[PDB]
């Protein structure tokens, strides 16, 4: 392989399918989409948006958090295992936090959870996801050893901000979160940023990524799943956003991030390398939506497997290499 | 039956499929949506949100009065006849109205209306639909005895209102009807309220019924069907709006409210009963929409056939029973 | 006088101040405007909008109901006595409530008030105020023998709805009230109706008057001060709407509706007979606000005393004549 | 034929299928629909709004500038080639123009360009646009003899303006185009107009056509593809927008407009002629458009076949006659 | 004098006051302000915006076309005549406008007009100004020889635009206007193009100028009066606009744009030069206001006195020199 | 004095006025408002929204840093020294930041600044302010020991947020500062938080204070000056916007909070304490604004000098005392 996985881990048992021979894309489809439907639960409305790392346990070799919108339209954390990553097993039940200090017992009431992103680090695996304050959408915090109890920490920060996705090491001795400020409606703006942070509490010195810049991430833009480390600097995958009269087309793409310094990007795909095509992507409760929350990488071979939201209803896969994606970054980069 | 249909009729003959043993739902629909398609008639281009009573005829056992767009979009009502309520004959040209008494002749122009309720009461049927008065939406009022001739009435409302409905019998003496102020757009805000009118034509002791509660239903709500009277008071199906960034999705779920005094809530479910989830509801002239304006009750047995619009293209049918719709109402109760 | 003032009081002390001799116009200002400060009260904001008319009591020769808004910017009603018209002695505190009957003391709570009219109809004083009902504006009515203690009626009307003016004598034995369908915030839109009730509790026959028209009436309108009998029908001054690019602009007229059918319009003067242009109209809580809500008229010589609203901070006076007015109207009028 | 087609060609070869004996419709579509695909280009997103003229080659009896929008979402123009209409070979790269004078070098630099509009006229075949200047929208001109050069001419209007479309003569001695004065966004309003020149440089002696008027239209309208010259005037296709709660939903008629000075309308289609109804019209990058740009006429028999958008993703076709559509518009005129 | 006015009038009479020793602006003004005020005519609601010349007739020395708004709030111009510039007597009814040639009979009938400007050129007055084409804002132009009869020509382009200004000269042998497309409302953007013209009826060759830029000119901009020459370029006057939390700020400065092609910026000042401070401009029918339409300029002296719409009620009057100005403008340029 | 004063400072030479003997009024204004013009500095278009500390310099007694908005509407802060605190001498030219540390150099760009608060801890000042990070509205942050050179610190916040206050000492030995997420434009929300740092840099514990309550604030909130410290908790003025139909009026009032988590309202006025209503609050920049950014506090007294912005266009002071305050504010308490 051209371009080297660092920190990655073996995933021979990785979900794959060959690219079809007459597929011309950098990314190509599971033939058998959504691999999570959305009445897979009793009390399911639809799933998506929805976290997924490698984790042995007694119902497989994968685990998630997933992004579960009840029959009241509510929205709640599932935690679900899969033996092969594409046939899941979802608790019907919601996530219930357990405080990890006494300190936030007061402040951290339920309310809703959506699009929760997941990644292990050193010693655990963390759980950012949008996590409502009062009613009003910030970063909710958490870690969890076995994905059974998850322990809750302080908001990342003050509202109104949305797709807070870790950074899966710490930077110069620092944890790194994406995020992205937001209003309280259906935020019609959208840079990413960087936050830092020694304990996983205290957040500063914050640092602008980029903004909408191509057409097809005009309207906004946001992190997409946790970034993956490279020879290059950090692949990250984005989703970015055009608006019609009609609505939002939400399609999803890849930028190189310097290696010390996020922030600074080295390269940035001028097209989208996945947009709104299918039937169950363009059609659903949201529709023309494709927004990647995690990804699967063999470090052995390169190969990724890609969760995506479809039209806020299901949860679709999609393959392709980080040499494929990395080389079409590079030979068509914006700036 | 645990809960008593009250002053309700015996309809054996009410179209009916059982509910398959993979269903998990307090509703199923129709196996061959939609009863009614787009262009049944030479000149429709939709029709869709239809009200529809037992009517003994000649040319069948149940009457309706059906929204039909044409193809200039225009918004029009037709009346229509069926045998087993499945398969209709609607009247190719629109009902052009009588007026009932001299003193409306150069009030009541015909601009446009859509969205008719019916029932009887007493001696005759009352429809009930959203009616232009100099192109402001308001509440329209007409009866008939034969769905051959119409005779309008007094405007119930000043504009803007939409969504009337009437009560299926006097109560305290008074008719009742359900409306729901609105505003001379795409209303983004709806409460639930009624009036009252000894007379059919002077309206007063308005009373708020109840207003967006859940996710599903936080846009706003209005009246769906003719109330059922039953042993827990009146059983009131009604939809409610969910905005996304893309638009509107319209679902339906019950409540049920007191028997004397219906703008007081005794149950309201939290959970949608039906929502927006096969082609012929999410794929149309208005995307994701299901509207129910009729339903049919057999008292001998509980059993309720549903009549909705679909994507503001077809009507559609579903199917539940009185038993099953009140004791989810009350086991999954807001407030 | 050539128009003749029918059904109408004498009022030889009439407040009053003889037309200048360098005045076009055909109202024209009373010199020490504002007549009632902003801060009249020891706990208002600002008293503006407010009902005037002939009572003889111990505090003097007139009485009134007043809007106040207090330092919480909350909106109340205030009644008020006057010996010469001019100076006003308004009660502190504000007016509660008295329900008629019992059967509105569930729906009746005090939520806010504003914008008042008055008027003696045959046997008392009839109150109409935009009256909060559950937070939505609609029509309040109320009646008082004595502007000591007020009696609440039912709301005439569902929301959202403002601007309610009685008319001061029944017509073909039915109470006759203009208003103005509104919605739930700045409304940007507004025709007058009017809407007939047997009893002053429940309404129907509603009637189109008319809509926005001329330039400085081009937003919307709604209706003033009660309605004046005339030989030439119903006098009735209203307020109509500019939108410019920072806000609205109020000023007021007047139209001439038949004496029979008063949504029939005989007469509607094409300009503005007043509009904001003192430093005390164009300044203040809400600027470029000309809104009169009552007027004395002395049968005997046809002489008007207009009370509005200026700029939402403070009440001021202006004089015309009947005469003057009809001849205005008449010559210089639209459709 | 009843109507004769003036000034036309002879087209035995157009692409042609009969009217099915279950149709009921003016328009019948194509049963092959698309007969072009949104990834017919390897860089393709989309390709629809397309242009399409006879014209003689070695690839073809047809030739078109078609509007591609590349997967990074840029609005492009590619000419392309055909030889049954049906079937077409479209360049993979955009068209890059020529200036026509050296005087245009400066100022026609290239943005975007979309919805072409092409007609043959005394010695060339002229192409209008949607140019960007300086990433306003207005109409781009052009000439082309051969479709493999194209010569850019000034931009015909100031921004912001849509939808310009040449008549395929002079008239009066002068050059006539439709065009559609818009916004900088969404354009929520639109009517109608022409413009003369005596060079096709300078536009002067602006014309309204006509504006919105029923309800499918009643939001915006724009003219559709070339106009074509008849014994009854100018038929012209034009689409018109209806406004729904979520968003636009385009449809087309066709009007007739006065030979001599063709501002003026003679006849004007109440109904839309076709609306969105099919799967590849309902769902894509834009719900609900059908778009029509391009129409080939074969003066010997009236038959037409019709090029227009799907869901701004696709191209589809349609076909009717010329006696067919001025027999319906004339029979089914609005105003 | 360091800069030298080009193609100017001897003016010794120029309306002037001296620059106060205390005045540390660039601009000072008039110090009995407004010099018209709103009421000067009977009928007159406002008179703001207006055009002024030097002109030797029966009634002064200066005559000019006003912008007056009548009581209606009707938008209307009317002819005045100065002795000294500063007192005008304008008369009392508005201009109804004489077609040049018979060909615009039908088209150009009278709507509206507002904001004229005036400028000879080589033999007659040219008057643009916005004018109504079915009640759509574009440029209307005319001529006169005397100023008592008008004769109205083609409107110069398309809906929607404003700000239509002419060079008072041709400039490669052709007319040249300023003008700035908008849309149908409170146009919340705007760029200064201009256009070129052989003939005064066709108009090509459109250039963009410049686009708001500083933050008080952030939101829009528009010509002002008559460009004047000098030997830097051409001197042009301009209006700029900021949105506050209320609304608009407008207040005007000055760029100097190449001698041979105008829409090529040579300088533009980065500041304002005037902006609302004074009661007249900041209190009025439109807040916070002030709108130069003409300035007279003393070639012998380089002595300029300004007249601009103040609050869009009354005109008043400013003074500054060329030199004073252009050297400001090139020490304070933005870009 | 009921209400003592914790941890203040001894201000004998408070600028100070008596309460006039006719005011009914908890704060009185200074009778020779404003204390500082929008003109006093040769640049400035307007000099409002200030902080104010006491500090002995050579140039007086008390210091500030102030928002200057220059004749391009630039914002800017500057340095500025009073011996009375009453006549200011502002810098000149804009405070240029110095980086606290270089690992700032590069993001710390200068953009803008307003709004800025100024307090003493331990052992120098603080300054936070509205800054431009990406021309997005945040919190800036920096310190100074003399007000001649200023050190910038790291945002405390990633944008949308202002109204950024810092308490004037550790609270549990952590930094705690309101803000008030906000949006990218003229907000039309906002809540009051505080967040919790050990260092200055690195920001978390965010915490919910209180959001929009009365009418007079019922858009939106947002801290005003310094919080004072005092026996009943810390005493807060802060700012209330109601909106009208003509934009926004921003009042002020007080909430006392408990001293140790001060996000726990103990009391909150419900009425205003000073609201727009002398000619310099009402007329200006931005009409109906009272904004206070600073007060002084004399330990030994009571008294408070109170320095807020009007009409964003001048500075003006007002006076009263702690135990005033604290009585009101706790007598008239909303929750």
Chains 1, 2, 3, 4, 5, 6 share one sequence.
């Not at 908001?155 to 110069?172: D, E, H, S, T």
């Amino acid at each position: 392989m051209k371009t080297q996985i660092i920190n990655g881990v073996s995933l021979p048992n990785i979900p794959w399918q060959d690219k079809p021979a007459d597929c011309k894309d950098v990314i190509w489809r599971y033939d058998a989409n959504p691999i999570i439907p959305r009445d897979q639960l009793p009390t399911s409305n639809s799933i998506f948006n929805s976290a997924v790392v490698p984790y042995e346990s007694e119902k497989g070799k994968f685990a998630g958090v997933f992004r579960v919108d009840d029959k009241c339209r509510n929205m709640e954390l599932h935690a679900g295992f899969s033996k092969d990553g594409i046939h899941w097993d979802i608790n019907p039940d919601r996530i219930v936090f357990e405080q990890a200090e006494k300190s936030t017992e007061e402040v951290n009431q339920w309310g809703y959870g959506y699009d929760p992103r997941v990644c292990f680090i050193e010693d655990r695996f963390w759980v950012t996801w949008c996590n409502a304050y009062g009613w009003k959408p910030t970063i909710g915090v958490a870690y969890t050893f076995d994905f059974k109890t998850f322990y809750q920490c302080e908001n990342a920060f003050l509202p109104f901000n949305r797709n807070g996705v870790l950074f899966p090491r710490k930077i110069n001795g620092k944890y790194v979160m994406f995020s992205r400020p937001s209003d309280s409606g259906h935020t019609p703006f959208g840079d990413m940023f960087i936050s830092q942070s020694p304990d996983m509490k205290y957040w500063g010195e914050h640092r602008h990524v980029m903004g909408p810049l191509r057409a097809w991430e005009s309207k906004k833009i946001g992190a997409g799943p946790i970034p993956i480390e490279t020879s290059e600097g950090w692949l990250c995958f984005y989703h970015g956003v055009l608006e019609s009269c009609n609505g939002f087309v939400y399609s999803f793409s890849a930028c190189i991030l310097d290696k010390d310094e996020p922030w600074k990007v080295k390269y940035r795909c001028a097209e989208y390398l996945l947009s709104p095509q299918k039937i169950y992507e363009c059609v659903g409760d949201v529709q023309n939506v494709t927004f990647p929350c995690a990804t699967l990488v063999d470090a052995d071979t390169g190969r990724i497997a890609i969760y995506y939201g479809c039209a806020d209803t299901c949860v679709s896969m999609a393959f392709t290499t980080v040499d494929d994606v990395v080389d079409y970054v590079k030979s068509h980069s914006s700036v």
